[PDB]
C-alpha cells in the first residue's frame, strides 16, 4: 500500500472483519467472569470419559474454526488468493488463530477459561490426558492476557497469523508475501498510532503457536490410536479434515 490513508483503510477493514466474525462478544465474556464452575461441577468434568471430553473439545474447536474460516473469507486479499493457497493457509493457520482468540475467554486474575457456560481452571480438562498441552495453552493465553491485547490488536495480529507467506505448499508465495507485508504495515501503523509499540518485543516467540498446534496434532494421534472408532464416528468432519 502507498500513503497512510490506504494503510488506515486496511486497519479499519481488518478490524471490521474481525468484529463480524468473533464468535463471542468481549463484553459477554467479561460479564460472565463471576460465573465459575463449582467444585462439584469440576469433579463432574473430571469423571467424564476421555473419549467424551475429546469429542466435546473437538466440537468446540470445530465451531471456533468455522468462525475463523468466515474471518478469512472477509479479508479481501485472502479471497484473491487461489484456492490451493486459501486451503494451505487455513489448514496451517486456523488452529493458531483460535489459540490466539482464546485469550479473550481467559481470566488471568484466577486462571480460568470460559468453557461450556462458565469459567473453569485447567483442572477442568484432566480427563483428556493431555495435561502438557492444556497447560501450555493456558500459559499462552496468560501471556497474551498480560499484554492487555485490544480487540483491534487481536484483529490485526490474527490476520497476520493467517496470512503467513512461510506456509509450505503455497503456489503464489509472492502474492502472499505482499499481503503479509501490507498487513504488517497495518498492524504496526496501528500500534504506533496508539502508543502500543512496546508490545512488539513482548509478543510470543515465533514457533510458539506452531508448538501448540503440533502438540495438538500429536495428542490427537495418540487418542485416535486408542479410540479410532470414536474419531471416525463422532468427531466433526471439519476437525478430521484439518487435523487427522
Amino acid at each position: 500500500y502507498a500513503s497512510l490513508t490506504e494503510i488506515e483503510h486496511l486497519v479499519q477493514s481488518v478490524c471490521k472483519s474481525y468484529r463480524e466474525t468473533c464468535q463471542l462478544r468481549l463484553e459477554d465474556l467479561l460479564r460472565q467472569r463471576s460465573n465459575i464452575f463449582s467444585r462439584e461441577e469440576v469433579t463432574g468434568y473430571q469423571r467424564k470419559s476421555m473419549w467424551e471430553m475429546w469429542e466435546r473439545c473437538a466440537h468446540h474447536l470445530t465451531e471456533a474454526i468455522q468462525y475463523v474460516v468466515e474471518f478469512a473469507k472477509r479479508l479481501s486479499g485472502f479471497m484473491e488468493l487461489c484456492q490451493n493457497d486459501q486451503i494451505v493457509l487455513l489448514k496451517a493457520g486456523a488452529m493458531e488463530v483460535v489459540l490466539v482468540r482464546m485469550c479473550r475467554a481467559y481470566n488471568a486474575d484466577n486462571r480460568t477459561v470460559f468453557f461450556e457456560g462458565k469459567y473453569g481452571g485447567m483442572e477442568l480438562f484432566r480427563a483428556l490426558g493431555c495435561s502438557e498441552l492444556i497447560s501450555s495453552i493456558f500459559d499462552f493465553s496468560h501471556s497474551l492476557s498480560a499484554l492487555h491485547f485490544s480487540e483491534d490488536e487481536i484483529a490485526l495480529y490474527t490476520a497476520l497469523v493467517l496470512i503467513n507467506a512461510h506456509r509450505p505448499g503455497l503456489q503464489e508465495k509472492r502474492k502472499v508475501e505482499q499481503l503479509q507485508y501490507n498487513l504488517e504495515l497495518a498492524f504496526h501503523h496501528h500500534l504506533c498510532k496508539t502508543h502500543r509499540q512496546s508490545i512488539l518485543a513482548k509478543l510470543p516467540p515465533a514457533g510458539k503457536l506452531a508448538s501448540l498446534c503440533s502438540q495438538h496434532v500429536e495428542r490427537l494421534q495418540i487418542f485416535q490410536h486408542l479410540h479410532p472408532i470414536v474419531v471416525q464416528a463422532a468427531f466433526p468432519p471439519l476437525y478430521k479434515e484439518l487435523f487427522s
Binding site: 474460516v69 473469507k73 484456492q83 486459501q86 486451503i87 487455513l90 489448514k91 468432519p237 471439519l238 484439518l242
Partner: peptide, 9 residues
C-alpha cells in the same frame, strides 16, 4: 472438501 465447500458458499 468441507473447507472447499465453506470457501465456495
Amino acid at each position: 472438501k468441507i473447507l472447499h465447500r465453506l470457501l465456495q458458499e
